[PDB]
Amino acid sequence: TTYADFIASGRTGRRNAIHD
Amino acid sequence: SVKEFLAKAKEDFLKKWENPAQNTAHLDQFERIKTLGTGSFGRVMLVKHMETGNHYAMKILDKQKVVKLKQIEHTLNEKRILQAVNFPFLTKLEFSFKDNSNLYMVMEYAPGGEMFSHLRRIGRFSEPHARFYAAQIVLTFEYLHSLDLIYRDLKPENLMIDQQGYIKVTDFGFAKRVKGRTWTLCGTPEYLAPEIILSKGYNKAVDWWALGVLIYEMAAGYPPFFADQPIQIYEKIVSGKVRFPSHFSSDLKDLLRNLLQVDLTKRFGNLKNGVNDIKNHKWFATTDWIAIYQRKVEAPFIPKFKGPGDTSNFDDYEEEEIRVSINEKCGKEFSEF
Ligand SMILES: NC[C@H](c1ccc(Cl)cc1)c1ccc(-c2cn[nH]c2)cc1
Numbered sequence: 001t002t003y004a005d006f007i008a009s010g011r012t013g014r015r016n017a018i019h020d
Numbered sequence: 021s022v023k024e025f026l027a028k029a030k031e032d033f034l035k036k037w038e039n040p041a042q043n044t045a046h047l048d049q050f051e052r053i054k055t056l057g058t059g060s061f062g063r064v065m066l067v068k069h070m071e072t073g074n075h076y077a078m079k080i081l082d083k084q085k086v087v088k089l090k091q092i093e094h095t096l097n098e099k100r101i102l103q104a105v106n107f108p109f110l111t112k113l114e115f116s117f118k119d120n121s122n123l124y125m126v127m128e129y130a131p132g133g134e135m136f137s138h139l140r141r142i143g144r145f146s147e148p149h150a151r152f153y154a155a156q157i158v159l160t161f162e163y164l165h166s167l168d169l170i171y172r173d174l175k176p177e178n179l180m181i182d183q184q185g186y187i188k189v190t191d192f193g194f195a196k197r198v199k200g201r202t203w204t205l206c207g208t209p210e211y212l213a214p215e216i217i218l219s220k221g222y223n224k225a226v227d228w229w230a231l232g233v234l235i236y237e238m239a240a241g242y243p244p245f246f247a248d249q250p251i252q253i254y255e256k257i258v259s260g261k262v263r264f265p266s267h268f269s270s271d272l273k274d275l276l277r278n279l280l281q282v283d284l285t286k287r288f289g290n291l292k293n294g295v296n297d298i299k300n301h302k303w304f305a306t307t308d309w310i311a312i313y314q315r316k317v318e319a320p321f322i323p324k325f326k327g328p329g330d331t332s333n334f335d336d337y338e339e340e341e342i343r344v345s346i347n348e349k350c351g352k353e354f355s356e357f
Contacts, residue, residue, distance in 0.1 A: 006242035011210070016208070
């Protein structure tokens, strides 16, 4: 499921802003 | 009349924009209690103002680290904007000041914690719950955009819950006062408009795209474009495809199709009728906008209260010293702060 793929991903924690 | 409130708000803002408040307190006036979050060039602390006993959130920026990260102009934007603005769902800048080592911004403390924390734990929000928060963002952007401000970092990580269960938008590190286009590649990967990814000049429309992502993520429990690496996410965002969970209502799907629209001429919020396309959408039909502004409508969730300086809705971080060098760092760079 899409939920399970998200929860297994490395991007469920606080996400950093991008920059240079 | 929205128009009249906004005209008056712009008069209030410009006065403070053209003559920004400066050096309105000092470190020793505050008791430092706990770190509420920590990151690259700065952290945020719960502090107590000793002369009043009021609790505030104090953001501390290491001037040398801001320089290294090329965030000087963006940091001066943050403070100049925050001291000038005034809106119920923005965190009020009460004081600002600097010393040899650091920049300080003292804001109202929101004891309910980050939307991020609650969204992740609960898994997802019901559509009414999500709609309640979304309305407050819709009004905040209406306010900010009327002042020619672009916000540029909407996400659950940057939305605080107050004691009454209403939102405070915080983190104005990338906020900018621009009439026309701007080009900076900034924001958070999941939330970037196609424009930004494709190095186009862009405008406030990127904020309304970011609203679409937020609403989706609030209602689904995960964002519309995710992957393990940023590049994979950007490929999804530019593709022009989005799947909605079967539980998404017809109206929700339709709001999001119009918000997450790669075509600027069709993106809601960016059309001839402006923000009212959003405000008058069927999904918001139950929304009483004035009642939301007056914070008269009941929160679908009210945080656990345990005193004035309770930090239990925030995570724990290692406490690190606030050290003040005997030598002034980066004096010229931050002269106007
Ligand atoms: N991104 C919000 C920032 C923060 C949170 C967590 C981490 Cl790890 C780093 C930075 C933050 C900003 C403002 C406030 C706050 C709370 N009440 N008033 C302001 C808390 C956290």
